[PDB]
């Protein structure tokens, strides 16, 4: 692999996801593929569909082979079923050759291909245990590590809030400055990591740390927002309201049913608090914090040319605390499967109007935190 060649290999933005161009089959068909650290299947549109331009036609690839079974994936808010096959795939930027991988071609779906998306397949980069129909269906990244002789590590930078980069097989030094901090992967399915504390404007939420991990705290590039369990979400909304210099937001704003609008260049950014998430260091005596500024969670959206409107970048969850694109837009994130850890560095690209919109710092002591914040 050539990591430098992978810089800027993603297109897209937060609300719509970040995608990689992949060439599938013989002769190659080019698809736009969502980079998803929250699932473990390589799956592409197999038919025309609303909201997509293009799909992979198996009949036009001479190297495609059908496994003779299908797969159905069900999420909380959507589903799809596809035929499972194998074919050769090329990633134009960082590699010299094609590779043989599993692929699901979607022939039916519910609430999966959405308005506004520019992708027509997904690349699940999570662990084998999440793969469907079972963990024996070799994942794309397991194929790539095995066939391309790369290290079992990839890293991602999202630059939309300021395209992006997906560096398969390592870390690209040009994508960060300052230090990389690593937190252990607690459980290898999703990228589940341990959250010790959330802090709003320097004020810790007063919750038992198990509240942050009971469902599971995961890092997921395929989720747009920062999703917080209801109790945690309520506490965050209360603290942001308390901390705003002048009250600006209705209840409808906090739930996503209203926009907050200001006349062009009147947004009082200095009014709103930083939000920090504390993660355990590999040395359990220490933690570090990843911090997002208001510009990352008070998110620009389309009132007409005279106003700038904004939607809240955090939402309630049912089943996980999801560190989605809202937060990943601030950091270079290293998914170090080989060493069972997730790394973070501030993204130099996460700057607006000459100011960083994220920070990372440490170390902090964990002596006043339970030794395990994942329920036991």
């Amino acid at each position: 692999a050539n990591f430098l060649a992978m810089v800027d290999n993603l297109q897209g933005d937060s609300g719509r996801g970040y995608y990689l161009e992949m060439l599938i089959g013989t002769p190659p068909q080019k698809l736009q593929i969502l980079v998803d650290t929250g699932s473990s299947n390589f799956a592409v549109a197999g038919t025309p569909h609303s909201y997509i331009d293009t799909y992979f036609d198996t009949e036009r690839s001479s190297t495609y082979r059908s496994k003779g079974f299908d797969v159905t994936v069900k999420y909380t808010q959507g589903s799809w079923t596809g035929f499972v096959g194998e074919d050769l795939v090329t990633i134009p930027k960082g590699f010299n050759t094609s590779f043989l991988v599993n692929i699901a071609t979607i022939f039916e779906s519910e609430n999966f291909f959405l308005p506004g998306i520019k992708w027509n397949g997904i690349l699940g980069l999570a662990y084998a245990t999440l793969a469907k129909p079972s963990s024996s269906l070799e994942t794309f990244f397991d194929s790539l590590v095995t066939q391309a002789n790369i290290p079992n590590v990839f890293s991602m930078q999202m630059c939309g809030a300021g395209g992006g980069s997906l560096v398969l097989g390592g870390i690209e030094p040009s994508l960060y400055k300052g230090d990389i901090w690593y937190t252990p992967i607690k459980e290898e399915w999703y990228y589940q990591i341990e959250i010790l504390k959330l802090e709003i404007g320097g004020q810790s939420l007063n919750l038992d740390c198990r509240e942050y991990n009971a469902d599971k705290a995961i890092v997921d590039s395929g989720t747009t927002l920062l999703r917080l369990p209801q109790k945690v979400f309520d506490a965050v909304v209360e603290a942001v309201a308390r901390a705003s210099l002048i009250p600006e937001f209705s209840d409808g704003f906090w739930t996503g049913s209203q926009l907050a609008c200001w006349t062009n260049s009147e947004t009082p950014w200095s009014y709103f608090p930083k939000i920090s998430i504390y993660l355990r260091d590999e040395n359990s005596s220490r933690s570090f914090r990843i911090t997002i500024l208001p510009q990352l969670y008070i998110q620009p959206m389309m009132a007409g040319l005279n106003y700038e409107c904004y939607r809240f970048g955090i939402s309630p969850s049912t089943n996980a605390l999801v560190i989605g694109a809202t937060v990943m837009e601030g950091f270079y994130v290293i998914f170090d499967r080989a060493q069972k850890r997730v790394g973070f560095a501030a993204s130099p690209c996460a700057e607006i109007a000459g100011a960083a919109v994220s920070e990372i710092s440490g170390p902090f002591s964990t002596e006043d935190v339970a030794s395990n914040c994942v329920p036991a």
Partner: nanobody, 111 residues
Framework: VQLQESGGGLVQPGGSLRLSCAAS????????MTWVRQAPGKGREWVST????????TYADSVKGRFTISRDNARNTLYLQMNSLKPEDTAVYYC?????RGPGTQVTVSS
């Protein structure tokens, strides 16, 4: 999932071996299968991959024409036929699928 390699040995330059990998605990007829090799002090080196129905095969340039991958789905076995062996081919050879690997079989090529 269980993979078990056998068939390695100590051969002279220009010799041959037939490696086997016995698979169990999964549907072998639906698995992409791969051979990799690693010698002490060197990085892991991909050798060859075969799709599940055996029709698609890929090889490292370092082994192309000398090694041939094959499988017998009905017998849950992956093979590597190795001809024209060279000292540089000395390594532990492992068969892998879905992130799992066997314990490996040693191939040593020496005069």
């Amino acid at each position: 999932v269980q993979l078990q390699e056998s068939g390695g040995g100590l051969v002279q330059p220009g010799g041959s071996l037939r490696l086997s990998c016995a698979a169990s605990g999964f549907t072998f007829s639906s698995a992409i299968m791969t051979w990799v090799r690693q010698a002490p002090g060197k990085g892991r080196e991909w050798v060859s991959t075969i799709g599940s129905d055996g029709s698609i095969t890929t090889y490292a340039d370092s082994v192309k024409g000398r090694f041939t991958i094959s499988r017998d789905n009905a017998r849950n076995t992956l093979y590597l036929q190795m001809n024209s062996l060279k000292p540089e081919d000395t390594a532990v050879y492992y068969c892998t699928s879905a992130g799992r690997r066997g314990p490996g079989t040693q191939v040593t090529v020496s005069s």
